[PDB]
Amino acid sequence: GGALSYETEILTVEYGLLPIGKIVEKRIECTVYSVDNNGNIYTQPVAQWHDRGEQEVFEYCLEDGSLIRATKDHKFMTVDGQMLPIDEIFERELDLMRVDNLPNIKIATRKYLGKQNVYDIGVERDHNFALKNGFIASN
């Protein structure tokens, strides 16, 4: 289910906003944020840690100026809840759901950057988690 760059911060109950790459490089145990089948933001522990090592990373920039760094194989929870890869979100010009009831906005600009270290935590209940910008990623 793709991966996210070191600079991608994950909201956690144990500490707060911390870089996903440090959680996987140091195997840090913590709790994360996610919606249930009803749309209720609950909290759950990390199940496992996975490290891709180096994959094709693309810049993901928004209409507001928010800046995100991920692979074209990582899915993200759309405004309706669909788990589609960012390569397909750009083509349909679909928006992504937010935690803070922020205005949903599609990818303003995209380009290939190169081959950066990317990481992705694993989870038992639901393979998803919130982000610093109120976003939700899913594996």
PDB file of C-alpha atoms in Angstrom, residues 33-121:
ATOM      1  CA  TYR A  33      -5.998   8.370  15.036  1.00  0.00           C
ATOM      2  CA  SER A  34      -8.553   6.870  12.547  1.00  0.00           C
ATOM      3  CA  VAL A  35     -12.338   6.820  11.732  1.00  0.00           C
ATOM      4  CA  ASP A  36     -14.540   3.744  12.314  1.00  0.00           C
ATOM      5  CA  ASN A  37     -17.300   2.336  10.003  1.00  0.00           C
ATOM      6  CA  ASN A  38     -19.597   5.088  11.488  1.00  0.00           C
ATOM      7  CA  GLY A  39     -17.141   8.024  10.807  1.00  0.00           C
ATOM      8  CA  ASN A  40     -16.073   8.376  14.520  1.00  0.00           C
ATOM      9  CA  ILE A  41     -12.382   9.394  15.057  1.00  0.00           C
ATOM     10  CA  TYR A  42     -11.074   6.726  17.504  1.00  0.00           C
ATOM     11  CA  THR A  43      -7.496   5.842  18.652  1.00  0.00           C
ATOM     12  CA  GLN A  44      -5.549   2.544  18.212  1.00  0.00           C
ATOM     13  CA  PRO A  45      -1.990   1.138  18.819  1.00  0.00           C
ATOM     14  CA  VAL A  46       0.561   0.384  16.032  1.00  0.00           C
ATOM     15  CA  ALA A  47       0.546  -3.348  15.107  1.00  0.00           C
ATOM     16  CA  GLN A  48       3.851  -3.525  13.088  1.00  0.00           C
ATOM     17  CA  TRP A  49       6.532  -1.402  11.283  1.00  0.00           C
ATOM     18  CA  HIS A  50       7.473  -1.649   7.549  1.00  0.00           C
ATOM     19  CA  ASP A  51      10.370  -0.013   5.632  1.00  0.00           C
ATOM     20  CA  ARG A  52      10.407   0.088   1.789  1.00  0.00           C
ATOM     21  CA  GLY A  53      13.989   1.489   1.731  1.00  0.00           C
ATOM     22  CA  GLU A  54      13.815   3.551  -1.541  1.00  0.00           C
ATOM     23  CA  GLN A  55      10.840   4.027  -3.960  1.00  0.00           C
ATOM     24  CA  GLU A  56       9.764   6.619  -6.593  1.00  0.00           C
ATOM     25  CA  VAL A  57       8.527   9.648  -4.525  1.00  0.00           C
ATOM     26  CA  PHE A  58       6.336  12.373  -6.028  1.00  0.00           C
ATOM     27  CA  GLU A  59       5.617  15.864  -4.690  1.00  0.00           C
ATOM     28  CA  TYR A  60       1.980  16.234  -3.543  1.00  0.00           C
ATOM     29  CA  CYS A  61       1.061  19.946  -3.246  1.00  0.00           C
ATOM     30  CA  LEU A  62      -2.420  21.363  -2.462  1.00  0.00           C
ATOM     31  CA  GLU A  63      -4.405  24.471  -3.561  1.00  0.00           C
ATOM     32  CA  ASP A  64      -3.909  26.013  -0.038  1.00  0.00           C
ATOM     33  CA  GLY A  65      -0.082  25.386  -0.096  1.00  0.00           C
ATOM     34  CA  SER A  66       0.088  22.191   2.093  1.00  0.00           C
ATOM     35  CA  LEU A  67       3.110  20.036   1.054  1.00  0.00           C
ATOM     36  CA  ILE A  68       3.157  16.189   1.250  1.00  0.00           C
ATOM     37  CA  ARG A  69       5.666  13.525  -0.039  1.00  0.00           C
ATOM     38  CA  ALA A  70       4.459  10.031  -1.015  1.00  0.00           C
ATOM     39  CA  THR A  71       4.489   7.179  -3.595  1.00  0.00           C
ATOM     40  CA  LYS A  72       1.901   6.598  -6.385  1.00  0.00           C
ATOM     41  CA  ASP A  73       1.043   3.214  -4.717  1.00  0.00           C
ATOM     42  CA  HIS A  74      -0.169   4.815  -1.428  1.00  0.00           C
ATOM     43  CA  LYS A  75      -3.971   5.168  -1.163  1.00  0.00           C
ATOM     44  CA  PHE A  76      -5.685   8.062   0.642  1.00  0.00           C
ATOM     45  CA  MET A  77      -9.258   8.283   1.999  1.00  0.00           C
ATOM     46  CA  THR A  78     -11.286  10.491  -0.455  1.00  0.00           C
ATOM     47  CA  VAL A  79     -14.225  12.769   0.541  1.00  0.00           C
ATOM     48  CA  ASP A  80     -16.599   9.747   0.083  1.00  0.00           C
ATOM     49  CA  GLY A  81     -14.164   7.290   1.839  1.00  0.00           C
ATOM     50  CA  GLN A  82     -12.732   5.510  -1.288  1.00  0.00           C
ATOM     51  CA  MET A  83      -9.191   4.015  -1.027  1.00  0.00           C
ATOM     52  CA  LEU A  84      -7.606   5.071  -4.381  1.00  0.00           C
ATOM     53  CA  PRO A  85      -3.897   5.741  -5.255  1.00  0.00           C
ATOM     54  CA  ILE A  86      -2.777   9.397  -5.618  1.00  0.00           C
ATOM     55  CA  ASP A  87      -1.919   8.753  -9.328  1.00  0.00           C
ATOM     56  CA  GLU A  88      -5.704   8.328  -9.874  1.00  0.00           C
ATOM     57  CA  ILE A  89      -6.803  11.220  -7.543  1.00  0.00           C
ATOM     58  CA  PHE A  90      -4.833  13.662  -9.793  1.00  0.00           C
ATOM     59  CA  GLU A  91      -6.567  12.395 -13.007  1.00  0.00           C
ATOM     60  CA  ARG A  92     -10.170  12.609 -11.623  1.00  0.00           C
ATOM     61  CA  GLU A  93      -9.243  15.851  -9.721  1.00  0.00           C
ATOM     62  CA  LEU A  94     -10.847  14.355  -6.553  1.00  0.00           C
ATOM     63  CA  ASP A  95     -10.375  15.861  -3.074  1.00  0.00           C
ATOM     64  CA  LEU A  96      -9.329  14.079   0.199  1.00  0.00           C
ATOM     65  CA  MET A  97     -11.223  13.983   3.544  1.00  0.00           C
ATOM     66  CA  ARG A  98     -10.012  16.013   6.612  1.00  0.00           C
ATOM     67  CA  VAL A  99     -10.164  15.595  10.434  1.00  0.00           C
ATOM     68  CA  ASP A 100     -10.576  19.332  11.311  1.00  0.00           C
ATOM     69  CA  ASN A 101     -13.590  19.830   8.906  1.00  0.00           C
ATOM     70  CA  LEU A 102     -11.229  21.812   6.661  1.00  0.00           C
ATOM     71  CA  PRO A 103     -12.258  22.540   3.000  1.00  0.00           C
ATOM     72  CA  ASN A 104     -11.413  19.525   0.791  1.00  0.00           C
ATOM     73  CA  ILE A 105      -9.086  20.378  -2.168  1.00  0.00           C
ATOM     74  CA  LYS A 106      -7.544  18.217  -4.944  1.00  0.00           C
ATOM     75  CA  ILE A 107      -3.820  18.117  -5.892  1.00  0.00           C
ATOM     76  CA  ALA A 108      -2.861  21.572  -7.268  1.00  0.00           C
ATOM     77  CA  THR A 109       0.548  20.399  -8.609  1.00  0.00           C
ATOM     78  CA  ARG A 110       2.522  17.130  -8.937  1.00  0.00           C
ATOM     79  CA  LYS A 111       6.010  16.143 -10.222  1.00  0.00           C
ATOM     80  CA  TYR A 112       8.446  13.236  -9.784  1.00  0.00           C
ATOM     81  CA  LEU A 113      11.229  14.162  -7.288  1.00  0.00           C
ATOM     82  CA  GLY A 114      13.357  10.985  -7.249  1.00  0.00           C
ATOM     83  CA  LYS A 115      14.056   7.998  -4.950  1.00  0.00           C
ATOM     84  CA  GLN A 116      13.766   8.745  -1.220  1.00  0.00           C
ATOM     85  CA  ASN A 117      13.465   6.556   1.888  1.00  0.00           C
ATOM     86  CA  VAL A 118       9.735   5.863   2.469  1.00  0.00           C
ATOM     87  CA  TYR A 119       7.981   4.048   5.347  1.00  0.00           C
ATOM     88  CA  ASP A 120       4.513   2.703   6.337  1.00  0.00           C
ATOM     89  CA  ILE A 121       3.277   1.492   9.759  1.00  0.00           C
TER      90      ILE A 121
END
